[PDB]
């Protein structure tokens, strides 16, 4: 069932014999952070909160120990889908507060909550259903992750059929055991690549589920002898893993994108919402694609979009509008990848759309043709822009964007840039083996 | 029992505790496609259908994603013959509908349904009992498929007798547990080659069983440590694997082919039906033999037929009439191989045969001699044509065939040719190791 | 249940079927010493005590065997958290007495008891909750300790997720089973590094728990196939393992340090307590860092402090004041490492702190800036002294320290210096492989 109060949470712990409670939160860069709490400490923790080292939320660029207090949220209580012989295990979330009592503005979760409040000021609320894609590789003799494939299936194929089939089934059952309400799971285009579609639900709950989904799948694969990876592009020559984000806005319990009186069955607000996204998508591209590997996926010749356009029938467009209408009307953004931070990505995605609605930004004419087949002169004539080519270019765009700074806050903005800046500098000075193969003998 | 209504399907799921439902459909090229659905979603799925990416139907030549709705068919519900510890697993089939509500004409299942409807206009219904042949190889240390033999048995031999014998028995029991009602199963001519025969049934039901049969057998072999292969010719110097198709036309509940008054006990319609098949078999040979490897099997010196002829006693003929009469009267076509798409293959066989009946096509005199033992002058004198030698030749014949395009529809016709054309072009530019062993030292 | 009397201890042994009783005590250098006693001998042991070779408390510098008598303390009875098929196992502590009946002054436990008694003269009592950090490596094929990492996680990371995850959970449950009342356990900065926090309690009980904690964790890791190491710096280029000590003084049941009137909410006594610690921390640094490897951790550029300073907001200082106030007011000293002797380390902390209170030593102005970023002239101008660079320097300081000698007693003082002196002399004459790599080719 659903737990609401701390009394209900305590009753469930005693009833089902939960021995350990694990907090859950993410840092600025999207890594999942957690620590364990004995079951007996839970009652005291609900009363006064737990002190911890809040400097862990500032990424790996932390310098000084700082103390903030975490106040648990009973509504987020859930039980992990594995049963150790010792006892049951459960997880819980909460809010971060400074010692003086003010909420800590560096928390990515707090960033999303502020965005929700801004949307609520205009009466709107967002529902997001993401589609997460991941790989399933083998493990070496020492248990370290590898890139060995498990099958050579294709799109929607009925694979695998060996022992790896049971591992895939176990992941589906474990997610359903927690009430995830999976829509559909299927094979993806690349070999040993799978996709899972989440139920179309509230944005705040979805973001927490996405974080929970990541380490649940990874834990299951280890105990079955496999490894699940979320790299945006682990192999060259095959499709990468992306996280498309279907979204919709609801006012007064009704979808606002649907308009029965328009030829495209789309409301005027939906046009503005797309217009806002297109205008600002270049600026916060770093948030949606936070690692260097993310831009190996964003290359022409695959399903990944590298051009800024919106369409109804075309699929290569950055923003795709599914043919579904009515209450199910939705807008799909195809840029993000699973390595992104769901809290930051959704918050910017919401904030960008609202700014377009507020300012009535015209999205322009849709692109129903194949952009990849057009020439540069055609693209220049049509005024079609392109996403940043590499991480360094994305940082330069995001670094002068005042809209991103205003939305994310000063603290998160500065910390995110410095962490990415140091990461890029380390990468740019490495001599890759590809250079040796091409240049050692020629020169 | 047999489930006919969605209420019965739901009751069976609750009764037998089925946790996952898998859809089932095939693309244009014959690959089996599927995706999973949680048991809770089943009730909603029956009411409204499931939206999915239908670009997977168009093969691996897909370019743009297109959305259309699948409506489940409760009459096709069945439970897979393996019991995971989590719960039971079941599969289901359905029809593909475009968003506007019109059925999708690119579905291979829809192609067969149109052919059945065309026969219904003339008052005929067809029953098909196919003979499927496959190999049983060993797996390497990494679980990848190999071509290692399991026994050196011969035709109808009592082999294997080692632990592989239990694996073969499990396949037979699992198929019977699903209600396929197998007729017989025996060893084949080549080592480690086995054959399974099906009972007569409605052509639509038989086609679905053939698709289900393929991945059921493959799954069982993996879990026992072996591999089942359906290549038309996996080894050189031994017989290949083919899928003969015994077929009969039923009108008013009685067999059309049977005729007690004729000396051969075959009706005039059966003569026309054979004549129609012989006239057009050359055109759609690519459908019955879709892959390149299929033509390594159609070479003289084995049971595979390579000349267009029909006979009552000879076995080398392309079309053979078994000695059985009465309701068991049937016509066997020996060209197809298990790699073919059963929906497309049967639809063309039915449509081609009906055209002969309408046009009173005379099949000509049967060939009761050994065609292989004859000379080219004799074959030229007798006017005996031959099947296409390679995949490229078959495509050229199919491409200009007006009848084939009309039967398969424009969408399937164009897509099928392009996929095969690209496949052949890749193959023709490879340097095989056989050339090196022959020409490196010589030249 | 809390065992108090020998009758209660005997009743518990019979009830829970404990077959073996293990004594527990430590030598001067911090090694854990123990010997087994049959359950039947327990009743006789309580009446008269156990005679044993008392030369084991002097370390590895023992020369002549001497006899002292151990008088068991029933209040320290505990049952170890593993269940052999033979029967339960329990541990117990006690005091060491010379044959003439006088207590042995060489016992590290007796040193702490004298320190507690000295504080009792002024009505003060201490509560200490330490934070112990340790590594978790893999065993080789022969079961010998090695240094292969089990995960590449970071600070507060939700790692490991493979089988090592269960091993970590077992440690947490086993500790809770004995009644340790753990606050929180989490991953640390270095890969495969973990931290466990204790609750506040009387310093005598806490010291015994720390000794018990060390071999309990080590035993669990072996039986699961891993190894837990307490080396202050097992790897180069990563953070070391330290044991921070949070301490507080209580008078009349109230916290002495807390003072609501002061702007910093710290009493005048707390300032003197810090002042005493800073004055004498240089002298007994060898006790807190007893092994040679401890000074590899004490290098600039990591979390380890190397400068004598105290701060409230800056956290790189040697002494840190957490933001908590009220009864939770505490002072954290960050120099010690897990290799230190808890009895000697805590005893010297009390003696140094009280001496500051008696003499009203002013702690000086806090350092709120980054000391590592300052220049040598700046630190010289600020008068920021430094901890000893290596074990030899620390011994020289500790050896002329009048305060340390009278605090630890003559017997412990002389024995500790000789043991460390011999250890350093052996190390200073070794030719390390690093020297060969740098100097063989160059010279
Ligand atoms: Mg996808
Ligand atoms: Mg046969
Ligand atoms: Mg720490």
UniProtKB/Swiss-Prot annotation, chains A, B, C:
Its EC number is 6.3.1.2. Residues 16-101 form the GS beta-grasp domain. Mg(2+) 1 binds at residues 131, 244, 332. It comes from the Archaea. Binds 2 Mg(2+) ions per subunit. Its cofactor is Mg(2+). L-glutamate binds at residues 239-240, 297, 303, 315, 334. InterPro entries: Gln_synt_N (IPR008147), Gln_synt_N_sf (IPR036651), Gln_synth/guanido_kin_cat_dom (IPR014746), Gln_synth_cat_dom (IPR008146), Gln_synth_gly_rich_site (IPR027303), Gln_synth_I (IPR004809), Gln_synth_N_conserv_site (IPR027302). Residues 108-443 form the GS catalytic domain. Directly stimulated by the effector molecule 2-oxoglutarate. Inhibited by GlnK1. 2-oxoglutarate antagonizes the inhibitory effects of GlnK1, but does not prevent GlnK1/GlnA1 complex formation. This is Glutamine synthetase. It comes from Methanosarcina mazei (strain ATCC BAA-159 / DSM 3647 / Goe1 / Go1 / JCM 11833 / OCM 88). The gene is glnA1.
